[PDB]
Symmetry: C2
Subunit: 207 residues, 2 copies
């Protein structure tokens, strides 16, 4: 019986409208003893339930049980810890997993736009770069938009630990060289705990 804890997505805890959740997954719950008991703790409190919500399923030759705990944006942002306790009769002792945002003071991310290299504008498509550095924790979200709509041909590198101990990454948007020249303006939106309304934005054009 294995147990994996999953944290909410970066955007979920940054937007009051979204719904952030902590998910507890248990794989390899034998066919014989499919009983699984979940106990949830938020800073060690709640052996007595909470929102909670399990379901039940069947796979290869084992069982999979998922429990979902909705969390409060500020509880997560305030570093609270979430414990999932999985008890199974076919287990020597209960298995406990715990997760939260990384410990450390939140640093504001610096977002810069970077136009393509002269030596690339000789190809049908160029690269519009968006540098995001000095942020912490690593939880973060990046997106691109040219006009009132998303650009879907871009990639973001995963965050990287700088010498600072803060985090940095690069998102690369790929545009038809023809567009970038038509004077079009693009922008990457970065969402982080340390940004004003959990959001800043930077423009990039050909002027």
């Amino acid at each position: 019986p294995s147990v994996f804890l999953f944290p909410p997505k970066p955007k979920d805890t940054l937007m009051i409208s979204r719904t952030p959740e902590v998910t507890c997954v248990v794989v390899d719950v034998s066919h014989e003893d499919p009983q699984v008991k979940f106990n949830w703790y938020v800073d060690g409190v709640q052996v007595h339930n909470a929102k909670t919500k399990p379901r039940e399923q069947q796979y290869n030759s084992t069982y999979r049980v998922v429990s979902v705990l909705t969390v409060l944006h500020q509880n997560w942002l305030d570093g609270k810890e979430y414990k999932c306790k999985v008890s199974n009769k076919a287990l020597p002792a209960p298995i406990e997993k715990t997760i939260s945002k990384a410990k450390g003071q939140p640093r504001e991310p610096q977002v810069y736009t970077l136009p393509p290299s002269r030596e690339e504008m000789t190809k049908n498509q160029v690269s519009l770069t968006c540098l995001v550095k000095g942020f912490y924790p690593s939880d973060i979200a990046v997106e691109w938009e040219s006009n009132g709509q998303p650009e879907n041909n871009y990639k973001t590198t995963p965050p990287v630990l700088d010498s600072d101990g803060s985090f940095f990454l690069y998102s690369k948007l790929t545009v038809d060289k023809s567009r970038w020249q038509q004077g079009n303006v693009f922008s990457c939106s970065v969402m982080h705990e340390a940004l004003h309304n959990h959001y800043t934005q930077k423009s990039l054009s050909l002027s």
Copy 2:
């Protein structure tokens, strides 16, 4: 037990100056169940001690008998399959792990250097950027230099899969806004299998 094979460092297979090596790491070997044996096979051949060399342990309460094999840059680059065959008493059966380089037509990388952003010109330090895309496989080594001398304060994002099945990454050198003001010239070095002479170098400056 628990075996894990590791491929050589990209930079090692691209320059004969260095020696590539397939490192076989076995964890959690018991005190009462030591005596760890090895066996390396390159494309089937070699069942008897090849040119290996393993030793050293001690951990959290376990072992870890790490074996090491010397690789031939050509052998690896051509895709020969390296097979580590561990054998232990406290192990139900003979575990195994193989590995060869990522298969597929290699693709030379494009290297572009970028100036720091106008907006970043407000800090006591700036960011010299190096973009690298269109390369396959992902094994790649990126370094920075200034008039012959090495740069230490730089970080490189790992290889990321782009839409076309090729990879790209970014390297970032942190330098004093002054050095960039003085007009110094920095260079981005890229080592890859598909580059002529396994090496290309791009420059940037004010």
